[PDB]
Design an enzyme around this catalytic site. Structure first.
Site, PDB file in Angstrom:
ATOM      1  N   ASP A 133       2.057  13.090  14.478  1.00 37.78           N
ATOM      2  CA  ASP A 133       0.624  12.550  14.761  1.00 37.78           C
ATOM      3  C   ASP A 133      -0.462  13.167  13.869  1.00 37.78           C
ATOM      4  O   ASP A 133      -1.477  13.266  14.331  1.00 37.78           O
ATOM      5  CB  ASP A 133       0.380  12.436  16.130  1.00 37.78           C
ATOM      6  CG  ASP A 133      -0.762  11.616  16.561  1.00 37.78           C
ATOM      7  OD1 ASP A 133      -0.951  10.249  15.674  1.00 37.78           O
ATOM      8  OD2 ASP A 133      -1.430  11.778  17.390  1.00 37.78           O
ATOM      9  N   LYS A 136      -1.309  11.860   7.512  1.00 37.84           N
ATOM     10  CA  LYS A 136      -0.332  10.919   7.196  1.00 37.84           C
ATOM     11  C   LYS A 136       0.556  11.504   5.789  1.00 37.84           C
ATOM     12  O   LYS A 136       1.572  11.328   5.766  1.00 37.84           O
ATOM     13  CB  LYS A 136      -0.716   9.810   6.952  1.00 37.84           C
ATOM     14  CG  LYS A 136      -2.034   9.536   5.854  1.00 37.84           C
ATOM     15  CD  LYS A 136      -2.397   8.360   5.574  1.00 37.84           C
ATOM     16  CE  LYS A 136      -3.587   8.207   4.654  1.00 37.84           C
ATOM     17  NZ  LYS A 136      -4.298   7.037   4.694  1.00 37.84           N
ATOM     18  N   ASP A 161       3.727   8.596  14.904  1.00 44.66           N
ATOM     19  CA  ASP A 161       2.837   7.402  15.248  1.00 44.66           C
ATOM     20  C   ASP A 161       2.331   7.171  13.848  1.00 44.66           C
ATOM     21  O   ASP A 161       2.319   7.559  12.704  1.00 44.66           O
ATOM     22  CB  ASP A 161       1.729   8.252  16.093  1.00 44.66           C
ATOM     23  CG  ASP A 161       0.829   7.291  16.989  1.00 44.66           C
ATOM     24  OD1 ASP A 161       1.083   6.174  16.805  1.00 44.66           O
ATOM     25  OD2 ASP A 161       0.067   7.836  17.653  1.00 44.66           O
ATOM     26  N   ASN A 162       1.513   5.894  14.249  1.00 43.73           N
ATOM     27  CA  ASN A 162       0.634   5.342  12.946  1.00 43.73           C
ATOM     28  C   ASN A 162       1.300   4.943  11.479  1.00 43.73           C
ATOM     29  O   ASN A 162       0.716   5.258  10.596  1.00 43.73           O
ATOM     30  CB  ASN A 162      -0.473   6.426  12.338  1.00 43.73           C
ATOM     31  CG  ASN A 162      -1.295   6.783  13.931  1.00 43.73           C
ATOM     32  OD1 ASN A 162      -1.446   7.939  14.356  1.00 43.73           O
ATOM     33  ND2 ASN A 162      -1.930   5.700  14.557  1.00 43.73           N
ATOM     34  N   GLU A 191      -5.552   2.499  19.232  1.00 38.15           N
ATOM     35  CA  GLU A 191      -6.485   2.566  20.260  1.00 38.15           C
ATOM     36  C   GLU A 191      -7.767   3.630  19.590  1.00 38.15           C
ATOM     37  O   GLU A 191      -7.509   3.971  18.537  1.00 38.15           O
ATOM     38  CB  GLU A 191      -5.887   3.479  21.247  1.00 38.15           C
ATOM     39  CG  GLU A 191      -4.497   2.729  21.812  1.00 38.15           C
ATOM     40  CD  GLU A 191      -3.578   3.512  22.792  1.00 38.15           C
ATOM     41  OE1 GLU A 191      -3.304   4.658  22.298  1.00 38.15           O
ATOM     42  OE2 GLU A 191      -3.432   3.113  23.970  1.00 38.15           O
TER      43      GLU A 191
HETATM   44 MG   LIG Z   1      -2.308   8.728  16.446  1.00 29.71          MG
END
Ligand SMILES: [Mg+2]
Ligand SMILES: [Cl-]
Ligand code: NA
Length: 208
Positions: A133, A136, A161-162, A191
């Site tokens: 998380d 990236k 995530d993401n 979110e």
């Molecule tokens: Mg995230």
């Protein structure tokens, strides 16, 4: 950042001290007010695989640390690496307040420096699960690094995530195409705590 600090402020004012579920709900509430639920997917994976050693890359306000730590069995360990000292400070306050500090080892620094120290310095054999998380552009290199350092065993779960927004396309292409990884995708929704957007107005003044 300012958003993470306001999340913590909200928690301290409204969540019940030492109650991890109360802390999570208070954060979900703060973000709600301002496919499947993201918290629900993380919970489901951890309950499905029961990791005794869990590595978290990236921590902003301690939401993920608390969510994951509350589900760990006694004596199991969450190790959390976070590069920004300010986010790590907030994360520890959240973790303390949520009642899970005994399960969490928060480490400040860059994943690419800390990962090769996990065995020698944090008494890790192999990792049972990794939650990605953080930045990236670190997803694929840290994944390759985890492998290179001998921290992955057959059955180790990577949960990233993401992977769509902002996105980790190169990470996805690697683990999906590789016969070394068995991949499943869970549709989700961004979110508030995670991101924020804006428009820019730029009025041309001329060549000048
Ligand atoms: Mg995230
Ligand atoms: Cl977080
Ligand atoms: Na694959």
């Amino acid at each position: 950042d300012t958003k993470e600090q306001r999340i913590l402020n909200h928690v301290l004012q409204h969540a019940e001290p030492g109650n991890a579920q109360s802390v999570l709900e208070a954060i979900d509430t703060y973000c709600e007010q301002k496919g499947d639920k993201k918290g629900k997917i993380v919970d489901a994976v951890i309950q499905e695989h029961q990791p005794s050693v869990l590595l978290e890359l990236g921590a902003y306000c301690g939401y993920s640390a608390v969510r994951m730590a509350r589900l760990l069995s006694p004596g199991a360990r969450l190790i959390t690496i976070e590069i920004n000292p300010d986010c790590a400070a907030i994360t520890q306050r959240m973790v303390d307040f949520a009642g899970v500090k005994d399960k969490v080892t928060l480490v400040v620094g860059a994943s690419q420096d800390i990962i090769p120290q996990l065995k020698k310095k944090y008494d890790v054999d192999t990792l049972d699960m990794v939650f990605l998380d953080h930045w990236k552009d670190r997803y694929l290199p840290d994944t390759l690094l985890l492998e290179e350092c001998g921290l992955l065993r057959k059955g180790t779960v990577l949960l990233a995530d993401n992977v769509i927004c902002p996105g980790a396309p190169d990470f996805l292409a690697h683990v999906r195409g590789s016969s070394c990884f068995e991949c499943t995708h869970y549709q989700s929704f961004l979110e508030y705590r995670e991101v924020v957007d804006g428009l820019e107005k730029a009025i041309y003044k001329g060549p000048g």
